[PDB]
Design a protein around this ligand. Structure first.
Ligand SMILES: [Mg+2]
Ligand SMILES: [Mg+2]
Ligand SMILES: [Zn+2]
Ligand SMILES: [Zn+2]
Lengths: 633, 633
């Protein structure tokens, strides 16, 4: 089995060119990333109760500040990887602390009148607990009086039970603040397309790669994701509009409601006494994703720009420090305004130039080839595509406005990848001839082309290892050149799977107990409907009446024409069966705590009518192999 | 120039195979389309002042009921084309009338206590006026007391000035009802990606083609769009929620708010006293567009399915007739329930099967190749893809959840069309070799392949007329096979432009006066920003303070880093200029009814400071040529 190759001369030249374009002599990022350092993270890796690795703080130890970029790494991404590994407890300003790099995200702690308020308690309960214990090792041991979730992604709420006990939330001693839409979007994320998204995420975050100079370097936005217990306590206080002001633990918070920017539900806020702005995840030290390669709904760069502009309008004159839920802070009114201004301009440029070029008749990939950020934006390291990339953001923006079809009817009804591949290979003279021609292009450094054309040989002949080896070599050079962590990881993971095959592993975790319980029945029934093997059951008809005795809510589920419909507040006259149960019992079955059959046996699920129909319906539900092929058919 | 070819044997076989799958002996569609006929449309074509054609009622006269489908037409689309040409004034039920095929859409008239209420007054004021005149020739001359726009597309409001005088709306004599988000979306649709959308629409609606058996047949949803004066009066009353009920002219309307279905702003409603359901454009006698090839944001088929399911829940037991804003009604409670139920199932099937296959690892085009509607749905003519197609809807649904990128990094950074074209052609032995090889595939009927591969020769060598001729022949055979009107039109227009070149004809110089007047300043300034030639002005900086005296509002415009930002409620300190004006004055400059220089000279635009900086900003704005290339670079 083939292994990683050296960087080609073409790769070295491409990376070296970046040294002239970017000001690597400027070390400002490092000063800011080290500023306010209090204490390092514990060296001991965090392990779960079951012995699983949750967080290894030395994972990317090979990446050291002061060490030159290996020639198999983009030097800008190497610089960023050094920066994101600067870890520990930091002071941002008087009374505001952050723990950085104990997870993908930062945890923030604000000292108020009587206690502390926690922002965005990481992905895992275990990392959040460790981050809070670190804070308490150095700062006074005062109670948590409030938690804020800045937005609806898992790395900003997942560890909540590690910092607060829900008994205190219920008793009114601790309030949890979140933007309008938080709960619905947090819970629904990774449900409907969860297997596709998580398998794609295994490429994105480089989880399958070795951490080394020819492997993964980190995700640009943070190093990687923890792998512990995801928890969720529903918020008690909802922020619904910008201008909203609340006193929390004696400090005055003014909010900006920012839906549809980086996340569906998101908010930024200013603490007036500290002249300190929380930019959430809308301004960090990278160009971010207006579209994530993991696979997600495409975001609106214009809305994002306008939120940054509104932040300037509201706080620009007064702000003294800006911090965010990833990366390090920026200090000084002038400096804060510059970051906000350049990033505002950057997201607007993506929007407006994509639209202008589309109105001129350019199509998706042509527009992405042309759009280049102005020098004043592009020469700041904070605006480089370490997580997002300009190219895939621009493509996504064309799709946001005009969809997938580029208008040329030659592209309306193309054959699928494996089918077109066979025809391409045939017309180019066969697999051997394609590889020989592709080699010439490779030696000229045209790896973008080699990766496209050799992909046809692979999809036509997936057992051709010579083809897979060459495709891997091409992807790998592109990986070596990639400034985006996610780009590098997609390329290098593709190369690895082509050389070695897909490694057979456990499906990872699926849905946390808290997440499942917070899921409304509408979402649950849509998820079951997604799993239905429609073509297998198109001629069949099952109607079930469900009665949830605790909720006093009734539903009709109707499997008909190969789909599963649901309706709240109805009961069918002619149902095959009536199913009576509590919501708790349903959660128990979905969390695989009891089987459907045992729930029926025990009487927790009572059935009137055809006793077999619920089991029958469930027997038509698909199951997904997590490790589906990506770089081969 | 080459011209249209006969149908090949492969095309005849593909079309003939459809006769075995669909019940062509069922004439229900025709019975329903003829039911309630009162009077025909006037035979004389509607012409504008310059004798421009606005509406020719004989345009598709060659398509006659009872006449066999020509072998260059899909027999299912031929059937639908006969149906949509059934024209005139019709009674739906007591007090509800429609005028059908005086435009792409229907106009509906409902008789109430004291007057009439008009729904969806067509595209052009001239067709809407003629439609109302026809009604008034056969029913009592009673005043219009209300207008309803069911959704935010131009064929459902554009002729409004033909049915009501805006003076009567201002007087409070006529109310105009619309769904929440109507005005924002209607104006944005006309404006932001307007050149791209309008040029793509020239393909979609077959406007450039001759109406004959080898040319355009109609759009499936309706014949074609009128070409008269597009107008807009902003609504007075906004429907925000599904519970919502209003008594309009002595009749009770119960509304369903249906955002993100066929349009971003859409509503359905039931008139209680008449047991009559208006399905807007969410249930018609075609599979519709969850994504429009014209270019638009992708829609949510799950939401669409759920709206149809909710209509069943709310009105299913009571409803006696359902009508819509395109096509003909369905009568009878059983029959209405069946159409709603089958279409509900169809849109859910598209959503759920796409997700399930994506979760199994299938990618966009692979999924679209596999998904096939179940027999009970697919064998009803009302569910065939005459406007939408299952294939492009399924592709869009993948993109809705997962975006443009299919996960395989070989496709992450492809070369643009012209650049990859050159390389494909080189590796296939040159243009002549490709054309000779492609002919073999063509003769085997593999037109989907020929259209993809010969497209490379065209993009590599745009002046190669032999290549363009072969590409045209392949597209044309696909056009002859298409069941979707928009598909047929895209294919046949592409063929025509390849054979003949792009034929330029007069198009509008600006947006309509009513469109511009309805635009809010946020949109106005975003549209200017889109036009900014960023790369040309990246190093320049212009700041303008605006004061709108009629509004009592101030703005700052800032051109910086190649973008144009705007901020409401701010004035910058050392601005280049302060500009004082009214919205009317600003609109006239955009509409080219006045000149900026003259508006300044006359005193309508008062400027302090650098009086030429506004002129300078305008000089940097791009202009768009409508007739951009689609089938050649
Ligand atoms: Mg596959
Ligand atoms: Mg072009
Ligand atoms: Zn995050
Ligand atoms: Zn319409």
């Amino acid at each position: 089995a083939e292994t990683a190759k050296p960087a080609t001369d073409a790769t070295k030249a491409a990376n070296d060119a970046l040294l002239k374009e970017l000001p690597f002599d400027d070390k400002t990022s490092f000063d800011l990333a080290h500023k306010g350092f209090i204490a390092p993270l514990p060296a001991e890796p965090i392990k779960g109760e079951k012995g699983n690795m949750i967080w290894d703080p030395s994972k990317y130890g090979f990446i050291k500040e002061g060490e030159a970029a290996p020639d198999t790494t983009n030097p800008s991404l190497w610089r960023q990887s050094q920066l994101i590994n600067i870890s520990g407890l930091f002071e941002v300003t008087d009374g505001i602390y952050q723990v950085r790099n104990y997870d993908l995200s930062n945890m923030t702690i604000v000292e108020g009148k009587d206690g502390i308020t926690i922002f965005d308690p990481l992905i895992s309960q275990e990392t959040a607990k460790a981050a809070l214990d670190l804070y308490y090792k150095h700062r006074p041991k005062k109670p948590v009086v409030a938690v804020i979730y800045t937005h609806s992604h898992v790395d900003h709420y997942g560890g909540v039970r590690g910092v607060v006990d829900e008994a205190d939330v219920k008793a009114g001693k601790v309030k949890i603040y979140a933007p309008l839409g938080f709960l619905e979007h947090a819970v629904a994320e990774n449900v409907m397309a969860g297997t596709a998204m998580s398998r794609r995420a295994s490429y994105m975050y480089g989880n399958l790669l070795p951490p080394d100079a020819k492997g993964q370097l980190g995700a640009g936005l943070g190093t990687t994701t923890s792998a512990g217990t995801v928890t969720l306590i529903p918020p008690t206080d909802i922020i619904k509009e910008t201008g909203e002001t609340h006193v929390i633990d004696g400090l005055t918070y003014e909010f900006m409601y920012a839906p549809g920017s980086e996340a569906p539900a998101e908010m930024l806020y200013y603490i007036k006494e500290k002249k300190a702005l929380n930019a959430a995840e809308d301004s960090t030290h990278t160009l971010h994703n207006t579209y994530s390669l993991r696979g997600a709904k495409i975001r609106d760069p214009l809305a994002w720009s306008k939120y940054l502009n509104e932040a300037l309008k509201l706080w620009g004159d007064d702000v003294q420090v800006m911090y965010a839920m990833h990366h390090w802070p920026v200090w000084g009114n002038k400096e804060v305004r510059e970051q906000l201004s350049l990033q505002r301009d950057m997201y607007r440029y993506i929007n407006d130039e994509t639209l202008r070029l589309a109105n001129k008749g350019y199509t998706m990939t042509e527009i992405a080839e042309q759009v280049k950020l102005p020098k004043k934006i592009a020469t700041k390291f904070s605006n480089r595509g370490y997580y997002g990339s300009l190219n895939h953001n621009v493509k996504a923006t064309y799709v946001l406005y005009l969809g997938w079809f580029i208008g040329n009817p030659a592209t309306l009804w193309e054959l699928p990848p494996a089918d077109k591949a066979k025809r391409y290979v045939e017309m180019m003279g066969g697999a051997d001839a394609v590889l020989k021609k592709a080699k010439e292009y490779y030696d000229k450094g045209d790896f973008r082309w080699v990766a496209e054309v050799v992909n046809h040989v692979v999809f036509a002949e997936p057992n051709n290892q010579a083809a897979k080896n060459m495709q891997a070599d091409a992807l790998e050079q592109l990986g070596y050149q990639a400034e985006s962590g996610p780009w590098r990881n997609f390329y290098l993971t593709g190369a690895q799977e082509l050389r070695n095959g897909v490694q057979q592993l456990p499906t990872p975790d699926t849905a946390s107990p808290d997440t499942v319980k917070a899921m409304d029945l509408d979402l649950f029934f849509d998820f079951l409907a997604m799993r239905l093997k429609g073509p297998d059951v198109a001629d069949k008809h099952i109607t079930l009446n469900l009665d949830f005795t605790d909720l006093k809510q009734k539903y009709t589920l109707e499997m008909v024409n190969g789909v599963l419909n649901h309706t709240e507040g109805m009961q069918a006259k002619n149902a095959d069966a009536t199913v009576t149960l509590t919501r708790e019992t349903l959660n128990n079955v979905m969390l695989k705590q009891t089987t459907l059959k045992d729930a029926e046996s025990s009487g927790d699920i009572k059935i009137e009518g055809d006793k077999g129909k619920l089991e029958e319906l469930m027997s038509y539900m698909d199951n997904f192999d997590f490790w589906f092929n990506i770089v081969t058919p």
